[PDB]
Amino acid sequence: DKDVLRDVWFGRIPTCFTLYQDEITEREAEPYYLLLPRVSYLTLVTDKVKKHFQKVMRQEDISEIWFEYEGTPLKWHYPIGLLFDLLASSSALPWNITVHFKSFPEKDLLHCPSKDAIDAHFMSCMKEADALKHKSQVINEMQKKDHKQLWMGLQNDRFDQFWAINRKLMEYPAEENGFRYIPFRIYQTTTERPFIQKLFRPVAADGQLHTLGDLLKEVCPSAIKNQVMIHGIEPMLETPLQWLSEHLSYPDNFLHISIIPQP
Amino acid sequence: TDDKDVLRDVWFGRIPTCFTLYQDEITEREAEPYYLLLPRVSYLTLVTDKVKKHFQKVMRQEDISEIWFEYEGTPLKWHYPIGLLFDLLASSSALPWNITVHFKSFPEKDLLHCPSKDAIDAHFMSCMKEADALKHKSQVINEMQKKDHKQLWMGLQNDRFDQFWAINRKLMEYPAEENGFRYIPFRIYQTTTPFIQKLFRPVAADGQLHTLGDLLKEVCPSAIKNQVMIHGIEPMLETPLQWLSEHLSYPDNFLHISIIPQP
Amino acid sequence: FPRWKRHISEQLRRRDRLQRQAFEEIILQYNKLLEKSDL
Amino acid sequence: FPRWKRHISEQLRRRDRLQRQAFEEIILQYNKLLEKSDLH
């Protein structure tokens, strides 16, 4: 199973960053091509983009940077993979993202905080995830130095360094035979619509393990015409939920599941 | 000129291709790979003049040797159209198509030489003349003036769709009473570059139109888990063969049909 | 129109999407940079 | 290896052929050329 973790982690998304046309440039501006980590956040991967376009604009021209796809702004705290699966799966590669330096929508999009604060959203997501899995038991026993290693493991794309700590977060007491609750979030047609996150257990009353279909039957019976997409694949609805929470989660220990129609 | 929409999407079919110079080749300077979109219907030797020149600069003024192309150890036989080569050799692999460019060690007994563009012109006409011999007992290709033959060539070489089908529409026409070509020009390729070609008529004594399935049942009975590929698509077996020879042939009026496995 | 003609012409558009539309834009920019890199 | 696990592992490789392997090498090559222009 360790092979799945590695190809989930090292997943990529070819992306084309084109400067929004409205923007004025001293000299001509090239698109920046790049492979974004599905598990990372737009917050981390874009100083290389900000720096690329830094050259062609005077200080007066430059403002806070933000990203759009097809008119809709991109949330800084949704994982890059999840954003793509939900919003751009049907379109043609590479992922065409528009880069702005003007007209930030203060009404519809959170600000890009210090890189410090995406780290905040990451750790709160892990904390919430751990609360469902363990009654918050494990992440409260880690040294602070471990929280910054989880973060810097995600940040520097070092797999084994990250999963050095994260493995403990995936373990459970033998008698329980699975997590208490599974940390998951379901997304429907757009980012703006509120995601679903309820309580649900990976082991039944009988002792048999619950599947993906059980989660969907219980939490979202509209996915049973529709496509269920996790990290760019459609796992069989007969897939045990506990295994999915263990292997197909994003680094924030959550199962970001997309519901999208065909084709 | 029946369903021009299908004809144009076939004619303008492209294949993303990566050309890398072989490592053992003596260079005066490092040579970046040449990226290109190759026309599926043209010939490898006809459309690579820009690639050849790119590597001429890096290499010494000696050698000054004929250029050849290799795809993972196998020399590419330029008599086969670019689309057929890709479909047959590299389609199941990942884009772009990775072609190695050589200049030294020409495989004299494995690959035919291509000395002039005139020689390509020669091969092309032999293929059409063979095609028409099957369709109309050589009646149409012979009754056209030589100014029409050199127009078909100049149409393929210079990628002008209208100029080509100005002449080719006659070759796709048949006597109304026969309701089909005399014989259908086709070649079926196995995994290696020895093809199969017998005689086959588009209409039976029943009067019914023969399909692609009827053809394979009588000519290549080892398909049906094989996939049948023509211009990169897998048409329904129920597809009438006469319509295929009219619309899914290459400019040499042949149905180059590749038989590949799945995945 | 008939079943097969629709089905055939669909994949031609699907094929061009998968094979041409994806690389057309990047390959064009790659070549433009390549020529510009010959000073 | 049971049905779902095999099938999941295949898509992950299928996904990498289509999304990553297709663009990694050309994007790489594109950037090396770009530095040469920035530094004219």
Residue numbers in the entry:
A (entry chain C): 4 to 227, 235 to 273
B (entry chain A): 2 to 194, 197 to 227, 235 to 273
C (entry chain B): 10 to 48
D (entry chain D): 10 to 49
What do the study's own words say?
Macroautophagy, referred to hereafter as autophagy, is a cellular process by which proteins and organelles are degraded and recycled through sequestration within autophagosomes and delivery to lysosomes. ATG5 plays a role in elongation of the phagophore and its subsequent maturation into the complete autophagosome. ATG12 is a ubiquitin-like protein that covalently binds ATG5, and this conjugate noncovalently binds ATG16L1. The ATG12–ATG5-ATG16L1 complex functions in part as an E3 ligase to facilitate the conjugation of LC3 to phosphatidylethanolamine, generating LC3-II.
Whole exome sequencing identified a homozygous missense mutation, hg19 chr6:106,727,648 T>A, corresponding to E122D in ATG5 as the only damaging mutation within the genetically identified chromosomal linkage interval. Crystal structure of the resulting ATG12–ATG5-ATG16L1 complex indicated that E122 is located in the vicinity of the ATG12–ATG5 interaction surface; hence, we predicted that the mutation in ATG5 could affect the conjugation of ATG12. We could detect the ATG12–ATG5 complex when both wild-type proteins were co-expressed, but we could only detect a minimal amount of the ATG12–ATG5E122D complex. Interestingly, expression levels of ATG5WT and ATG5E122D monomers were comparable to each other, indicating that the mutation affects the conjugation process, rather than the stability of proteins. To confirm that the mutation does not overtly alter the structure of ATG5 or binding to ATG16L1, we analyzed formation of the noncovalent ATG5-ATG16L1 complex using constructs containing a TEV protease site. Both wild-type and mutant ATG5 protein were efficiently co-precipitated with ATG16L1. Indeed, the co-crystal structure of a human ATG5E122D-ATG16L1 complex superimposes well with the previously determined structure of the WT proteins, with the major obvious difference being replacement of the side-chain. Although the overall structure of the E122D mutant ATG5 superimposes well with the wild-type protein, the mutation causes a striking decrease in the level of ATG12–ATG5 conjugate that is formed when the C terminus of ATG12 is covalently linked to Lys130 of ATG5. We speculate that the E122D mutation causes subtle changes in the conformational dynamics that propagate to Lys130, which is less than 10 Å away, resulting in less ATG12–ATG5, which in turn leads to reduced LC3/Atg8 conjugation. Our results indicate that E122D is a partial loss-of-function allele that impairs but does not completely abolish ATG5 activity.
